[PDB]
Amino acid sequence: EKLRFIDEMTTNVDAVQERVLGEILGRNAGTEYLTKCGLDGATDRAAFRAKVPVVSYDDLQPYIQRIANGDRSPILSTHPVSEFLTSSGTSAGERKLMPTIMDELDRRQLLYSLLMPVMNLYVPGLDKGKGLYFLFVKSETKTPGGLTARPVLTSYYKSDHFKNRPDPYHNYTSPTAAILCADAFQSMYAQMVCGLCQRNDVLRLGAVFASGLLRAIRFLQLNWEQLADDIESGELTPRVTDPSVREAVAAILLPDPELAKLIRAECSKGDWAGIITRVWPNTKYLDVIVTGAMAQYIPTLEFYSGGLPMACTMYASSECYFGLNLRPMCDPSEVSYTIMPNMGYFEFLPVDATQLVDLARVEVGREYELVITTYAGLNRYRVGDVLRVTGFHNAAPQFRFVRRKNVLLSIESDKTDEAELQRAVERASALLRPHGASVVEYTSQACTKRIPGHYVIYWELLTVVDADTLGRCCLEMEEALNTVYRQSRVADGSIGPLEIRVVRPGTFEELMDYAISRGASINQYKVPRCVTFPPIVELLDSRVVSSHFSPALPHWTP
Ligand SMILES: Nc1ncnc2c1ncn2[C@@H]1O[C@H](COP(=O)(O)O)[C@@H](O)[C@H]1O
């Protein structure tokens, strides 16, 4: 029983953790990295705790670049590297490369196998229908040494764990051919058409991130005309060039006019509230992450779903799959993730290795940074995630996701940190300085009033700059932002043009006075992003003199 496995693992947290670390060290304690730490082959917890330092990405990057450039000696593991999983987190504007090994796919597959067993406890009958999940592959590259680098889900979807899988609780409408198609449009359109045809078997709707599902809905808003047509005519549109997709959908696309009729009846109305249960009326819930930065999207999802529950099922990363939500139907505000003690060796830094707290021993109410040791040879690596213990499941702590440290803005997988944002502001002022203008202060917000959302930067200038020049400032900020952002702009369409709102002189002084109604004066520092979803965003907006948008896409190529 998957459920009994969860109960055993969480009952025996600290014993499992010891055994896992023994397995990892049995595998790796003889690698270059651990030998350099002086472990000298020890596989026991006391030796490890004593000798292995806590590290960040930049401490490991020298080892990673050696592997990327073709070093195939056992640097990090006696299981050598199979590919690089590209985190959406960056350093110097480039994606961090998380080495993985072939063995880890099986542990990822184990975590996935736990999800529907838990869900089935709260939502009956899912086996009697399909899931409409919009899933997408993104671009791959190769390192100078020949290894592939690509996102974990892209790796997942192109793996046979996924392609040739044995299961009624995983009956999906999307043909893997459409999932694997490069082009966002063809992939989206083809998956929409298959979701609509099968509209009535659809018991749940989803995508990895809430924003992905929102972009699927916007896609419908823009293409239901041709969609209703191909449904009626039963003929695949020739916008779809990709021959492998055409063959997958045309394999289930049946001519159906009673179907096409309704699609027009619901999408012709200008009102799209509850559109999801109107097109897919047996939908029981939405399977999308809406914790952390995706929380922004909850109101928008509710409007389109008509109030359907939103399941946040899993907590995972490019470097390590962590665990799962044992209460997937709770309220989004109530989500906590139970880290699974078999997935790696997990330690916690209260927000140096002597302060590390073991998984079993974290304290309810406290916030910690996640520090992980993995089979792939990450050793006391800091993920950057801040977590708050909300309680315990048997001996296993449960965590509310707080944030990834230093991340200011995300629309999707982009994770723009304060350093990149500040440098972006500095690069755009080359357009301002000839006017005699400079940016006295700025802040930002992720704006999701439309799909896709976009970055809004507030500028208080000191000197007038014309509107075309300020729009070019938007573009320049985008050129300076990281590869994930620009890729999302040019390739995915998941982020719309960046917006600069110029605020009147004295605006940030006011922003100070409003927070001071609370905050400590000689403790205040201007927030570089604002989320207090009404009061502070409303105050800034109320001081805006003009608004400007990037008139063109930034540069990006894989
Ligand atoms: N429910 C969630 N599941 C996975 N990642 C999350 C969640 N909420 C926030 N995140 C962030 O997403 C990161 C994974 O980034 P990546 O390695 O690009 O997949 C995590 O380390 C978290 O900071």
Swiss-Prot record:
Consequence of gene disruption: Slight increase in disease susceptibility to Xanthomonas oryzae pv oryzae.
Classification via Pfam families: GH3 (PF03321), GH3_C (PF23572), GH3_M (PF23571)
Name of the protein in question: Indole-3-acetic acid-amido synthetase GH3.8
Cellular component per GO, a single term: cytoplasm
Annotated function: Catalyzes the synthesis of indole-3-acetic acid (IAA)-amino acid conjugates, providing a mechanism for the plant to cope with the presence of excessive free auxin. Produces more IAA-Asp levels than IAA-Ala levels in vitro. May participate in the activation of disease resistance by preventing the accumulation of free IAA, which reduces the expression of a group of auxin-responsive genes encoding expansins that control cell wall loosening and expansion. Contributes to late events in stamen and carpel differentiation, and influences floret fertility.
Note: Plants overexpressing GH3-8 exhibit enhanced disease resistance to Xanthomonas oryzae pv oryzae. Plants overexpressing GH3-8 exhibit abnormal morphology and dwarf phenotype. Plants silencing GH3-8 produce mostly non-viable pollen grains.
Family of this protein: Belongs to the IAA-amido conjugating enzyme family.
Distribution of this protein across tissues and organs: Expressed in the inner floral organs (lodicules, stamens and carpels) and at lower levels in lemmas and paleas.
PANTHER family in alphabetical order: GH3 DOMAIN-CONTAINING PROTEIN, INDOLE-3-ACETIC ACID-AMIDO SYNTHETASE GH3.1-RELATED
Organism: Oryza sativa subsp. indica
UniProt entry tagged with the keyword Disulfide bond: no
Transmembrane regions: none
EC class of the enzyme, as a word: ligase
Binding site for AMP: 88, 314-318, 337, 385, 404
Keyword flag Ligase: yes
